[model samples]
Target: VKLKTDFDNPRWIKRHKHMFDFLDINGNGKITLDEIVSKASDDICAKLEATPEQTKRHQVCVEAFFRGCGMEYGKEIAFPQFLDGFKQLATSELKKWARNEPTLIREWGDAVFDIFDGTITLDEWKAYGKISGISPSQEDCEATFRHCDLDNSGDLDVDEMTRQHLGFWYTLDPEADGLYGNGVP
Candidate 1:
């Protein structure tokens, strides 16, 4: 009966709701711990075939991302829990985590894509979204892609990608450009 509100912003609800679907790998409407952890150890690391050390690094990043999502390794998450978790992050933990886990925060964003080159096209973004298990629609991908295209160029570079995430973890601007990360229609 406690702790219910409109998340203080409509767009915040949109972002977190869609992101919940993106993270719920099983499509069961609930995000469990293994899915989050496996998303780290298997989806991001094993699927991409990273080195052992790099895989371990993702292990840290994924957990940190989950933590960034306002959750730990205990319970299942519906959209409400999901929203509140991010609400907590947007309040305080986002900056705290970013301050200490700079590398992990950046790497978590990097792991969401499959960019071996310096830049990624819309097609590359869609491809990574599918395999990474956060398969936002091509339309959503396009919106997210164009949003992150900092230079008005046709492609999104890794630096833009890095800044895009720092926009979330550090900047915490709900109206920040290059956000929505598939959070919008």
Candidate 2:
């Protein structure tokens, strides 16, 4: 069968490098349990600090996380292993998006449109990132613009924008015949 979407592409993997680096925290080339646990605790604390009920629950969550990663708690999380786990979960999510591509495209298009008229500007892209929690830098946004701009128009039109957003979820089917099943699309 023909592939419907592409995921695990080299470009896509490269795009995520910055995210891995950011998660590395200490520039150690690997994400440790310390980094994961501390960030999780900090994120929860920042959100639930004013609520006694949630704060108590948060403590349990933090404890649970520590217990869950006990074996690797003090060591670096192997980057490839972490990415494989991430992709395993992401595969299901990607299938869902592909199944609902039309509706999701419209929804995302409206969201980007709400930020800027006609097409997405660099400033609007950065603002969208901030609101979405990714908060990429101007350089990152520019790079994305370059990659997603199919028409050489310099800015993302709705089609370009939606496909760019969905591209991360697209990948080769596990059942595909021969070498196609062994690698990135």
Candidate 3:
């Protein structure tokens, strides 16, 4: 398929290069479906680790995420498309997490998603504030999401998720260190 290229956008090459690097664990030029899916699954499970059951469920969902994204091999996702897909998946998962927790949603839209409306903005997140307590400040929570948003478009994408999340049993757990490390030990 033909992909969009931006002449003025110097970062395109770097972004796609990084994406392939993340998925092409062996450093091959092309990315296979299995490699992509494996990374995706691991990342999802890590981010959804509120509990054992939740983590398990996220594993299943991660596989499903690849399926929904139209799995195939030999072709790499364009930078914008990759970011778009990431934003969709991350936002969807974030919303789902919030729905799973009622108290958090009511308190400050601070459900598992952390973002006010399930999609956090970059300018709003405050890392220091979130580090201050178990129930992260609304601003900090938004900042955390923004932190993972590689494109810096005020939302996260799959690359960001895979880079930080895949292969871990717990996502941002309810502790101070949870937010810092890339994943569970």
Clash counts for all predictions: 1, 3, 10
Per-model lDDT: 0.61, 0.49, 0.39
Query: CA shift at 138, candidate 2, in angstroms?
Result: 3.7
TM-score for each prediction? Answer: 0.66, 0.42, 0.32
Error of 1 at 62 (Å): 1.1
Please say which candidate is ahead in lDDT: 1 or 2.
1
Ranking the candidates on lDDT from highest down gives 1, 2, 3
Q: Kindly give the stretch of ten consecutive residues in candidate 3 with the minimal lDDT sum.
A: 167-176
What are the per-residue Cα lDDT tens digits for candidate 1 across 56-165? 76677677766766666777878787776666655454454446654444566565443234566778777666666565567767777656654555887766677556
Q: Estimate the overall C-alpha local distance difference test score of candidate 3.
A: 0.39
Across 5-53, the per-residue lDDT of candidate 3 in tens digits comes to 2323334334334544555656645455666644434443244333555
Q: Please name the candidate that would achieve the greatest lDDT relative to the true structure.
A: 1
Comparing 2 and 3 on lDDT, the stronger one: 2
Error of 3 at 175 (Å): 31
Question: RMSD, each candidate, Å?
Answer: 5.7, 10.2, 13.5
RMSD of 2: 10.2
